[PDB]
PDB file of C-alpha atoms and ligand atoms in Angstrom:
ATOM      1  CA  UNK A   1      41.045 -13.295-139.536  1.00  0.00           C
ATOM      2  CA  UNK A   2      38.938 -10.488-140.693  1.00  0.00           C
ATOM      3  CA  UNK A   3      38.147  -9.888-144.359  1.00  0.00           C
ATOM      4  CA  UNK A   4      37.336 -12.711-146.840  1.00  0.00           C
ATOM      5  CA  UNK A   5      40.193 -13.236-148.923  1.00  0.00           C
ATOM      6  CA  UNK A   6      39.966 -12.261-152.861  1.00  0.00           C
ATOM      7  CA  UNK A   7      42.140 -15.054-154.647  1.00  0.00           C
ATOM      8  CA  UNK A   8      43.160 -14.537-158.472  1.00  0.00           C
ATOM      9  CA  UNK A   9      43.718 -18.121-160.496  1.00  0.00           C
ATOM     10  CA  UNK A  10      43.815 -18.667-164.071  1.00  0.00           C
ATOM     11  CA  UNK A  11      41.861 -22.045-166.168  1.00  0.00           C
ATOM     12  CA  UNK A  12      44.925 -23.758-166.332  1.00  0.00           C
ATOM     13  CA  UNK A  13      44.788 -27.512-166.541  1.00  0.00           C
ATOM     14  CA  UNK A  14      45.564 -29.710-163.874  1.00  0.00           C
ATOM     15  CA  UNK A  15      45.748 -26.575-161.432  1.00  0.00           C
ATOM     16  CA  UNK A  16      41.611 -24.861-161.948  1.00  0.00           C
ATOM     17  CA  UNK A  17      39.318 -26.439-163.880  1.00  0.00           C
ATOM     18  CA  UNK A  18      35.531 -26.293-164.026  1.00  0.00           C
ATOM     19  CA  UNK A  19      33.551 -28.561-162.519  1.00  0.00           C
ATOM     20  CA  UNK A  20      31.723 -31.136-165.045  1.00  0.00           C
ATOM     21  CA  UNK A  21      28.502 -29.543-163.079  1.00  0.00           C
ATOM     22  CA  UNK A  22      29.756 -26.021-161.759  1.00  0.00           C
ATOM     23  CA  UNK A  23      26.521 -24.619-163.121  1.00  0.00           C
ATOM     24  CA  UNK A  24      24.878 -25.989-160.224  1.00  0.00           C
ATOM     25  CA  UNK A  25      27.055 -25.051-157.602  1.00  0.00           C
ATOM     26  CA  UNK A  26      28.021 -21.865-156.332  1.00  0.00           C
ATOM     27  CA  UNK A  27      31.414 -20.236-155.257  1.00  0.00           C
ATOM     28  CA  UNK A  28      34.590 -21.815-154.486  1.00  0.00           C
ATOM     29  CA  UNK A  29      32.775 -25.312-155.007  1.00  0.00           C
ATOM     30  CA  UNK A  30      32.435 -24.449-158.866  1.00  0.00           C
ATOM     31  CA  UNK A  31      36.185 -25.193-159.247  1.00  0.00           C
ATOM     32  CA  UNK A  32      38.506 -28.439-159.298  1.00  0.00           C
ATOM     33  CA  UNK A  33      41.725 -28.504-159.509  1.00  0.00           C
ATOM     34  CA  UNK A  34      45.939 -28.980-158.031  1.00  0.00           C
ATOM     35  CA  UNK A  35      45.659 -25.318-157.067  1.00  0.00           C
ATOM     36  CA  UNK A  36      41.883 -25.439-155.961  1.00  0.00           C
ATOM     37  CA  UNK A  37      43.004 -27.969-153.208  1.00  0.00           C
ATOM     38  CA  UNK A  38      46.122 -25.930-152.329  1.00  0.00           C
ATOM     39  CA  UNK A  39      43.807 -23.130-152.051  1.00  0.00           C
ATOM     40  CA  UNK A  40      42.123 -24.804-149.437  1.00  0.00           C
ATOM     41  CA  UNK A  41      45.195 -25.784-147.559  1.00  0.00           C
ATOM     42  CA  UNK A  42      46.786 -22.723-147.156  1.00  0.00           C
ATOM     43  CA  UNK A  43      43.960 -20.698-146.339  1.00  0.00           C
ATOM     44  CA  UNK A  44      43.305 -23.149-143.268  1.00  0.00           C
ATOM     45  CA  UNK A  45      47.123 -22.735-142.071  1.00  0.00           C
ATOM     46  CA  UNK A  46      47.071 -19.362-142.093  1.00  0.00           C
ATOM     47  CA  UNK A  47      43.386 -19.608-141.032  1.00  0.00           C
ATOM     48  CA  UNK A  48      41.448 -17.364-143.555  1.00  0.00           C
ATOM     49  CA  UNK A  49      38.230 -17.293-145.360  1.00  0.00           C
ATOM     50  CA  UNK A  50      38.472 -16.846-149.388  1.00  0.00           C
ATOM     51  CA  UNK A  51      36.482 -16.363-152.573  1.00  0.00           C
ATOM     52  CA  UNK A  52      38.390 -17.971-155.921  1.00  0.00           C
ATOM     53  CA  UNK A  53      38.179 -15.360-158.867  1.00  0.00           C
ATOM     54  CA  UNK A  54      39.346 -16.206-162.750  1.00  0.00           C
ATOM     55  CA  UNK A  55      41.679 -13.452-164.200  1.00  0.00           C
ATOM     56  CA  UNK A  56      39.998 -11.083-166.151  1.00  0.00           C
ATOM     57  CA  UNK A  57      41.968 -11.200-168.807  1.00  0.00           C
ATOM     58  CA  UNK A  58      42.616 -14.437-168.805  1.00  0.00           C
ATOM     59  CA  UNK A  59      46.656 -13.804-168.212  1.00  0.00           C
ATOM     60  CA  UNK A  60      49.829 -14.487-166.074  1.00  0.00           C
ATOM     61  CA  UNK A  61      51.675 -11.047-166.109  1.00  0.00           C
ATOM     62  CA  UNK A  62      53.871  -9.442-167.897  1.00  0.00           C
ATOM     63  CA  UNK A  63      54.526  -5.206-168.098  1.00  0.00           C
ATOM     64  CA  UNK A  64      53.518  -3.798-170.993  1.00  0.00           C
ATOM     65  CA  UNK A  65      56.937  -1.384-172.234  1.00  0.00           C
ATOM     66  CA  UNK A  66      55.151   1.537-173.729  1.00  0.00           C
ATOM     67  CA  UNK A  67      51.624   1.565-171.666  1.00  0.00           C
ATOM     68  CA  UNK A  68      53.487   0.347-168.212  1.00  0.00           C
ATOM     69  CA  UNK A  69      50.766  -1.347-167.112  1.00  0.00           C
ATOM     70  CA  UNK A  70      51.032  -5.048-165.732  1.00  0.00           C
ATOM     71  CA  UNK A  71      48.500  -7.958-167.111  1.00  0.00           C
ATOM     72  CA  UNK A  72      47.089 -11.026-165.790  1.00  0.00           C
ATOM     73  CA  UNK A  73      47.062 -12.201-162.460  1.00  0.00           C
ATOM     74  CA  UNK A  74      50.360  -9.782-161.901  1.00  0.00           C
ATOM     75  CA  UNK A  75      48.645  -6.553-162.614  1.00  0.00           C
ATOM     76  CA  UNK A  76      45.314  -7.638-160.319  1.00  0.00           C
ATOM     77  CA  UNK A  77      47.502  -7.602-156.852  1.00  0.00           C
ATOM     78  CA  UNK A  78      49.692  -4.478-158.171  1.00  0.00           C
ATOM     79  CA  UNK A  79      46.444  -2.562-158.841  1.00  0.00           C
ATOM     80  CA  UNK A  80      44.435  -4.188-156.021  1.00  0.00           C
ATOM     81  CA  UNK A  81      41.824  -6.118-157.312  1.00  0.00           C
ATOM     82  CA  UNK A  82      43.691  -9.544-155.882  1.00  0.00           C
ATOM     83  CA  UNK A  83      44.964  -9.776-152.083  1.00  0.00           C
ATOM     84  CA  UNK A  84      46.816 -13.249-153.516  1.00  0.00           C
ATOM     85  CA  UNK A  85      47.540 -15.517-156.388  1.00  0.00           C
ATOM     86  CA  UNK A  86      47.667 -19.328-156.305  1.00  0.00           C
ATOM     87  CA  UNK A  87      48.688 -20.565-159.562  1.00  0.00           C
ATOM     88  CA  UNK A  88      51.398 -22.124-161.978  1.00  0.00           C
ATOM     89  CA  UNK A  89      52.728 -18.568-161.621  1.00  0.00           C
ATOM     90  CA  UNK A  90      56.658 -18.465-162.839  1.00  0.00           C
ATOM     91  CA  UNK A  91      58.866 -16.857-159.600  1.00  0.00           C
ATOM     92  CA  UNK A  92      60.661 -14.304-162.059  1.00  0.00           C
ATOM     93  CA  UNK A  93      62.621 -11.256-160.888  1.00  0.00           C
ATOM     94  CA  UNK A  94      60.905  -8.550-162.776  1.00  0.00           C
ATOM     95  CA  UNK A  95      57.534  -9.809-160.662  1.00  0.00           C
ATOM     96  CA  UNK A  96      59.233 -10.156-157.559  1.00  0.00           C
ATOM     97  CA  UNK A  97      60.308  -6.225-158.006  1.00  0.00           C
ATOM     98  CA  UNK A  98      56.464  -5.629-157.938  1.00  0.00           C
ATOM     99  CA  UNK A  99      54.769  -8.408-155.922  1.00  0.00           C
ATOM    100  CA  UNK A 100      56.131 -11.078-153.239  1.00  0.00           C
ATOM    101  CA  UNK A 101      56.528 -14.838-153.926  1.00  0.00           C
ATOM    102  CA  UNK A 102      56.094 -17.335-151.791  1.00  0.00           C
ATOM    103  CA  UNK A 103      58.614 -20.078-151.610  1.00  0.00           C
ATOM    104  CA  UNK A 104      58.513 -22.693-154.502  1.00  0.00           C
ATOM    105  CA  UNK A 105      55.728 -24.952-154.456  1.00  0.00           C
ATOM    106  CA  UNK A 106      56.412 -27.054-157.411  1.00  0.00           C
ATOM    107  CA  UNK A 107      59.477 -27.089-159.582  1.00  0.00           C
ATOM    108  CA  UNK A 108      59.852 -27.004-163.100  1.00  0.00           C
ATOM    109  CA  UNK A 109      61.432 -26.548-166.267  1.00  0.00           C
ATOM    110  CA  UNK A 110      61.015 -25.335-169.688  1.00  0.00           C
ATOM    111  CA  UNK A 111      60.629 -28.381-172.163  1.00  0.00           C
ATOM    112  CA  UNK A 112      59.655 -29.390-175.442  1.00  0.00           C
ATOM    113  CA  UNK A 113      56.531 -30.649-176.324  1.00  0.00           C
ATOM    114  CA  UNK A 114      56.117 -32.661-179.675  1.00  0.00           C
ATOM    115  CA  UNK A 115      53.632 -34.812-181.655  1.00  0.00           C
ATOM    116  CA  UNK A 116      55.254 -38.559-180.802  1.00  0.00           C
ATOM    117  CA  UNK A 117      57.501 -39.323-183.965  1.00  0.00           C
ATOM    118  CA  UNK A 118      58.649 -35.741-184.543  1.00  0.00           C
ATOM    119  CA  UNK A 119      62.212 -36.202-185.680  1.00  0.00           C
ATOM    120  CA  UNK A 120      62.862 -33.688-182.281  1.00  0.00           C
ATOM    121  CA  UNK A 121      65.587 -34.388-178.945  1.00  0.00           C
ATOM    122  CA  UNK A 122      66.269 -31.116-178.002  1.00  0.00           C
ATOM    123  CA  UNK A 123      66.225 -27.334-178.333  1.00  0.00           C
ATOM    124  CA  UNK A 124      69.928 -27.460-180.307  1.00  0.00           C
ATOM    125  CA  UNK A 125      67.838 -29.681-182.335  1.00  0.00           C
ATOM    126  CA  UNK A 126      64.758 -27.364-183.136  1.00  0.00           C
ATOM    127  CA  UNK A 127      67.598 -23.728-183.607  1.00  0.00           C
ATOM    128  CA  UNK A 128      69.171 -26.229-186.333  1.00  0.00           C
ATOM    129  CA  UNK A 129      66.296 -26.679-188.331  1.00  0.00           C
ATOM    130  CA  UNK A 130      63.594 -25.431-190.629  1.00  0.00           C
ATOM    131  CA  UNK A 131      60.764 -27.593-191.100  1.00  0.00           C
ATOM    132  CA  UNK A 132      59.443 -27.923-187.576  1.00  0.00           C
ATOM    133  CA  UNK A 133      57.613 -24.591-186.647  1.00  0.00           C
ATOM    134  CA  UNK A 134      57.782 -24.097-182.649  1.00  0.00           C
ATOM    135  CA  UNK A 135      56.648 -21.283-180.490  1.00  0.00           C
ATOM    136  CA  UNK A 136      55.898 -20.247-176.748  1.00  0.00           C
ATOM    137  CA  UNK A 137      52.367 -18.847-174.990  1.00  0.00           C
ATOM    138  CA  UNK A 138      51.922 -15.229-176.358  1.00  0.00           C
ATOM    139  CA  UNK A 139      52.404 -14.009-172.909  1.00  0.00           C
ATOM    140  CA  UNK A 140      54.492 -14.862-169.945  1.00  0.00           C
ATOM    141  CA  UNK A 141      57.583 -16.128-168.421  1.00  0.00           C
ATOM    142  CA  UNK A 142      58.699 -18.860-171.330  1.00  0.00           C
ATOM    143  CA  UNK A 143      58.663 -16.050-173.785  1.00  0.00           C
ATOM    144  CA  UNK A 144      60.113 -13.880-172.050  1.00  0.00           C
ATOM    145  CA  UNK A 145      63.137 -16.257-171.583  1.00  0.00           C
ATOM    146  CA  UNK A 146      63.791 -16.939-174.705  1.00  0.00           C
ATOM    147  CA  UNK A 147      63.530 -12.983-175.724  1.00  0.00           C
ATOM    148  CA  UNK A 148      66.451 -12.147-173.024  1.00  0.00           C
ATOM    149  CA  UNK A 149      68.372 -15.238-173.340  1.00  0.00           C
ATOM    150  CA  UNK A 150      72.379 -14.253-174.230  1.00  0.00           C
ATOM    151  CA  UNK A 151      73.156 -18.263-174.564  1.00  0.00           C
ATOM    152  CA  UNK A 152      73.438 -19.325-178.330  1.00  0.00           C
ATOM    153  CA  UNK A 153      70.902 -21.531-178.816  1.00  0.00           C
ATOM    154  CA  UNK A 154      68.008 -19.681-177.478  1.00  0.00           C
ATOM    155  CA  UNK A 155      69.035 -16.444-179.252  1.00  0.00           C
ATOM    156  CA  UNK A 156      69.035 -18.761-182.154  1.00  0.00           C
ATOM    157  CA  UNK A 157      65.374 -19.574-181.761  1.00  0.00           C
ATOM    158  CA  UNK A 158      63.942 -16.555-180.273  1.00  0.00           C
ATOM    159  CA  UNK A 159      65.628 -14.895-183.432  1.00  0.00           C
ATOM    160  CA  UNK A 160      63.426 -17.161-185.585  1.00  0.00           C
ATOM    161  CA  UNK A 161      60.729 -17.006-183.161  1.00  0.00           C
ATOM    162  CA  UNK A 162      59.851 -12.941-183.313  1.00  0.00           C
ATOM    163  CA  UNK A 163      59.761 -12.814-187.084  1.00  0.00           C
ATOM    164  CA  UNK A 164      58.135 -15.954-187.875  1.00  0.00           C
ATOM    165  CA  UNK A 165      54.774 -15.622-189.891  1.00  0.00           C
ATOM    166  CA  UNK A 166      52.311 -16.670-189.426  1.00  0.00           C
ATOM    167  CA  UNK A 167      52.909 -15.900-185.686  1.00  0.00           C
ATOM    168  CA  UNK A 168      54.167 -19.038-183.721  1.00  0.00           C
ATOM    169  CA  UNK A 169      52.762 -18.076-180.550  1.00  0.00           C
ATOM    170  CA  UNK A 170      49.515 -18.768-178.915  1.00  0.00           C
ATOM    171  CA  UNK A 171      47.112 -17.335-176.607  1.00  0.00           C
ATOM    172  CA  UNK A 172      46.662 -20.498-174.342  1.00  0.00           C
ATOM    173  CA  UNK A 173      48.361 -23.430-173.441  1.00  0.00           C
ATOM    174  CA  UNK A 174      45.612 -25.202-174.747  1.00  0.00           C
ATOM    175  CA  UNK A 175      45.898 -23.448-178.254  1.00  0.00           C
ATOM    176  CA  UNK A 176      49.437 -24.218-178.017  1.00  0.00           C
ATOM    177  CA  UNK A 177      48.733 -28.371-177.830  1.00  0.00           C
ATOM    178  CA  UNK A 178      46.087 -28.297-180.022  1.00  0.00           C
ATOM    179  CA  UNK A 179      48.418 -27.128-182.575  1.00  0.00           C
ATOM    180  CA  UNK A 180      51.042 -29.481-181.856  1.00  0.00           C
ATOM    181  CA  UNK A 181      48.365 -31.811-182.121  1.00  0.00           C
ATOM    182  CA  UNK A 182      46.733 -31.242-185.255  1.00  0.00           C
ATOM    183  CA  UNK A 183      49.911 -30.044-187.093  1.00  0.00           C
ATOM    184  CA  UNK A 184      51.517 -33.903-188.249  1.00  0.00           C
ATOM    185  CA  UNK A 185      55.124 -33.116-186.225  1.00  0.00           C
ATOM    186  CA  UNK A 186      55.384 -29.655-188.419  1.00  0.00           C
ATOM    187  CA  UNK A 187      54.679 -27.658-184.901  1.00  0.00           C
ATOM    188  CA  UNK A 188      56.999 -28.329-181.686  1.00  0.00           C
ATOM    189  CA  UNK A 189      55.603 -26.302-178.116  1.00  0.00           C
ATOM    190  CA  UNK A 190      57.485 -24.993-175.928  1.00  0.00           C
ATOM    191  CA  UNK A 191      55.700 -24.848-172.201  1.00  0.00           C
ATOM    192  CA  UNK A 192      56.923 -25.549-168.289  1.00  0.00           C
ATOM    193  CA  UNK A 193      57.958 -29.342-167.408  1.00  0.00           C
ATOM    194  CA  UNK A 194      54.320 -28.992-165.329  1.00  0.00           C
ATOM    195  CA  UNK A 195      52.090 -28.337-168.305  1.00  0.00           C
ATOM    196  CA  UNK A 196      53.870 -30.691-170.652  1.00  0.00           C
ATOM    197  CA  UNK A 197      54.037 -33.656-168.036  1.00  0.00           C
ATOM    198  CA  UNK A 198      50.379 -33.688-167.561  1.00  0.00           C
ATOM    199  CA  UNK A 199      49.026 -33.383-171.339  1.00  0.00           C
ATOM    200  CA  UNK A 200      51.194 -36.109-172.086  1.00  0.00           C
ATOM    201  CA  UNK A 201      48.932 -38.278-169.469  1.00  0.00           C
ATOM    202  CA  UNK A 202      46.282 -37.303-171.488  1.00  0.00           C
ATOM    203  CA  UNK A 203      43.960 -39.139-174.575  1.00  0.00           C
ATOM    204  CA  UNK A 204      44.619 -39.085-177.022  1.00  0.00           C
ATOM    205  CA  UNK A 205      48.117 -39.851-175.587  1.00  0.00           C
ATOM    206  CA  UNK A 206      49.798 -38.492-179.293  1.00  0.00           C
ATOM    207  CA  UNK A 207      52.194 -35.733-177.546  1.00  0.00           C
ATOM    208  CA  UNK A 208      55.291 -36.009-175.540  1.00  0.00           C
ATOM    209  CA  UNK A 209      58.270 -34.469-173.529  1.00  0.00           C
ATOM    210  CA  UNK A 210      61.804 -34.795-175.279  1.00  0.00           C
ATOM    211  CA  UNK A 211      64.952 -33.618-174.007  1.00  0.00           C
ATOM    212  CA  UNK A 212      66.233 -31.893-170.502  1.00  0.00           C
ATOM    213  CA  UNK A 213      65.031 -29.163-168.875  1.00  0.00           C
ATOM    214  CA  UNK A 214      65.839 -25.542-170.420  1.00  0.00           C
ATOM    215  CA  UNK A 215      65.814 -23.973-167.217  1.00  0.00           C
ATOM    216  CA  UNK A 216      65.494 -24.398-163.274  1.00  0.00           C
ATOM    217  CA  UNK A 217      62.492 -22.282-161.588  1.00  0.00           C
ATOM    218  CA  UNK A 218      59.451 -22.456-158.993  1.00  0.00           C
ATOM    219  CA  UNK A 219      55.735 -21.499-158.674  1.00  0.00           C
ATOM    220  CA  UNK A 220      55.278 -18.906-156.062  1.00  0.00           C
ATOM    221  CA  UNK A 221      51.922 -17.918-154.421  1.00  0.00           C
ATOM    222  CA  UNK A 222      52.274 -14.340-154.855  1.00  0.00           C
ATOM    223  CA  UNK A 223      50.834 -11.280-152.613  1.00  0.00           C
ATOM    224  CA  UNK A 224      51.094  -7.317-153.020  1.00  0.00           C
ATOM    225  CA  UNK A 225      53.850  -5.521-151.302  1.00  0.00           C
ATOM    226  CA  UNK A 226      53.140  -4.972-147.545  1.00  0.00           C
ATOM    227  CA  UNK A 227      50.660  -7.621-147.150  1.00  0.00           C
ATOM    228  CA  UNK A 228      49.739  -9.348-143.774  1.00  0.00           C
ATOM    229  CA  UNK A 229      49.623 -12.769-145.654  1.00  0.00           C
ATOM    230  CA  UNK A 230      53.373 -12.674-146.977  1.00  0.00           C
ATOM    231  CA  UNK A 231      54.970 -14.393-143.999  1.00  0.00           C
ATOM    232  CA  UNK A 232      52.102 -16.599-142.607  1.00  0.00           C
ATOM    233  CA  UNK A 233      52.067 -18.187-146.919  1.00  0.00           C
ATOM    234  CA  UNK A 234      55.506 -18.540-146.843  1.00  0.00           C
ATOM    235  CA  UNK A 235      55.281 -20.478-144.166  1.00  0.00           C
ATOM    236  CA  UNK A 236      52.485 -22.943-145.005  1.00  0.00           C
ATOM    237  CA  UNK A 237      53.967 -23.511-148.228  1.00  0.00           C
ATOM    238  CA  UNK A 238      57.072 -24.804-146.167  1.00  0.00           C
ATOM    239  CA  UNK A 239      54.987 -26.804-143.833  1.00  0.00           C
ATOM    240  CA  UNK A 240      53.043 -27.941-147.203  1.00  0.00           C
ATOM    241  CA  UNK A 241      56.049 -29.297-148.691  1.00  0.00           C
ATOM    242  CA  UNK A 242      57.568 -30.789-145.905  1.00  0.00           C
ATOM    243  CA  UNK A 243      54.852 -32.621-144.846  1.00  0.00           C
ATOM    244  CA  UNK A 244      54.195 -34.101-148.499  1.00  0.00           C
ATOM    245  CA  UNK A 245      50.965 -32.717-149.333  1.00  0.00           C
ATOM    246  CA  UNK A 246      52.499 -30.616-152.803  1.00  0.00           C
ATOM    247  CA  UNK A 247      53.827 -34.196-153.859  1.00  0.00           C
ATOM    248  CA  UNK A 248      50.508 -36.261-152.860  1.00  0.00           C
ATOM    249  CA  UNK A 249      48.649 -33.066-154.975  1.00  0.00           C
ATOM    250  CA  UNK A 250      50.657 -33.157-157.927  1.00  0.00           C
ATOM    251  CA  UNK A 251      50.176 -37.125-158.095  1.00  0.00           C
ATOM    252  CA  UNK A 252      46.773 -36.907-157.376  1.00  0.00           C
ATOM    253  CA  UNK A 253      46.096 -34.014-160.704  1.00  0.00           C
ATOM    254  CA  UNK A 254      49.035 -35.715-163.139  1.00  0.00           C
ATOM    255  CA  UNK A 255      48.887 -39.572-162.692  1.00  0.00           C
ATOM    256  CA  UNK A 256      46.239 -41.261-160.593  1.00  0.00           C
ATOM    257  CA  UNK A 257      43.926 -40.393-163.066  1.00  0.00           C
ATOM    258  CA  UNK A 258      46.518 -40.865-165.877  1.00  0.00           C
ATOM    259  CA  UNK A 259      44.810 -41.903-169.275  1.00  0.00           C
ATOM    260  CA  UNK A 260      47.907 -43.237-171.148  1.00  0.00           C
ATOM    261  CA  UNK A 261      48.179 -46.133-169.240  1.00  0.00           C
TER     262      UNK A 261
HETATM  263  N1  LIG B 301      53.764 -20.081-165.677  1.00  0.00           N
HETATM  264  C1  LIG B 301      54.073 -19.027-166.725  1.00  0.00           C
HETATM  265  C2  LIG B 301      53.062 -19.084-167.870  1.00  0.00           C
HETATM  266  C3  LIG B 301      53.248 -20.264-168.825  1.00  0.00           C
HETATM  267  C4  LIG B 301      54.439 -20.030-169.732  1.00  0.00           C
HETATM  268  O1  LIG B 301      54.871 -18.885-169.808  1.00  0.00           O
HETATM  269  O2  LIG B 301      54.912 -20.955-170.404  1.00  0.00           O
HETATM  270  C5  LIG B 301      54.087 -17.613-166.180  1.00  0.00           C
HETATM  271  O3  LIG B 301      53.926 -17.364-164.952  1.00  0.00           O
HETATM  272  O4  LIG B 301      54.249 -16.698-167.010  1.00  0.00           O
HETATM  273 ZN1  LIG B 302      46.819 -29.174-143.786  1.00  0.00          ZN
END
């Protein structure tokens, strides 16, 4: 109601994406995207004006644990450069001991991604194995799962995960598919349910989800301790939900425009 609104969002397909002509257009207007129109819906519920802003360093978050200092769109509301976050941003509890989330927006899961054909059905599968590289993003909440997990399995492939050379981690989601991609069912991903349900929706249609869920988590809109936007965010998210706009949204970005068929 009195300051415009700084948001922090990452290029993250389905949720921001650049316009086809954004070069032409200025502001918020450059942008398309799940979290672009969500953007636009809380911000009229709570009844704010906002300017969308990339993250600088092109990150979700995570504490460095020699420098201290947090990353991505995590470290811009802790050091005040971001009033709020809407993005596929994990709800984790070492985040939400330095910023507040929102309720869930979306669910999800961590899953495995493979080239269609890889001889792959789960993550007991990949631990048991050799030939089948698989990694996470360099940076956030899936690797950081797999580096605390006490559960078998996952200690199991994290352990082969951290010494692995050449590195099977990647800087971007993107990277991360690509590789999958172009590596003839030698390279499994690991990504959220989100991420891996849309690219498989995708031309040229040669990846795919196996298996259940590794986990059970939510997306949070995050916001700085003490914040006057904590509670009225909360509760648009809520009203969001519950009046089906997150599920129109998430149909709208993952299969109306579906290219698989
Ligand atoms: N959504 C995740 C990033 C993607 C991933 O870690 O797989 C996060 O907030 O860290
Ligand atoms: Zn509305």
């Amino acid at each position: 109601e009195n300051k415009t609104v700084v948001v922090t969002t990452i290029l993250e397909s389905p949720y921001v994406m650049m316009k086809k002509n954004h070069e032409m257009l200025e502001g918020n207007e450059r942008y398309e995207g799940y979290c672009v129109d969500l953007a636009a819906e809380i911000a009229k519920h709570c009844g704010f004006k906002y300017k969308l802003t990339i993250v600088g360093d092109g990150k979700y978050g995570a504490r460095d644990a020699d420098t201290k200092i947090w990353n991505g769109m995590v470290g811009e509301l802790v050091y005040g450069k971001a009033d709020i976050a809407i993005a596929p941003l994990t709800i984790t509890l070492v985040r939400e001991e330095v910023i507040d989330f929102s309720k869930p927006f979306m669910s999800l899961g961590i899953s495995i991604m493979i080239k269609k054909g890889t001889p792959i059905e789960s993550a007991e599968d990949l631990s048991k194995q050799t030939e089948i590289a698989y990694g996470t993003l360099d940076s956030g909440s899936t690797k950081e799962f797999f580096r605390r997990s006490k559960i078998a399995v996952f200690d199991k492939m994290w352990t082969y995960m951290r010494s692995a050379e050449p590195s099977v981690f990647v800087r971007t989601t993107a990277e991360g598919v690509a590789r999958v991609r172009k590596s003839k069912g030698k390279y499994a991903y690991l990504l959220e349910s989100t991420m891996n349900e849309y690219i498989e929706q995708r031309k040229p249609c040669d990846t795919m989800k196996v298996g259940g869920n590794l986990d059970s988590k939510g997306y949070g809109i995050a916001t700085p301790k003490g914040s006057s936007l904590r509670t009225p965010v909360n509760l648009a998210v809520l009203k969001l939900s519950e009046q089906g706009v997150l599920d129109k949204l998430k149909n709208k970005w993952w299969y109306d425009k579906g290219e698989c068929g």
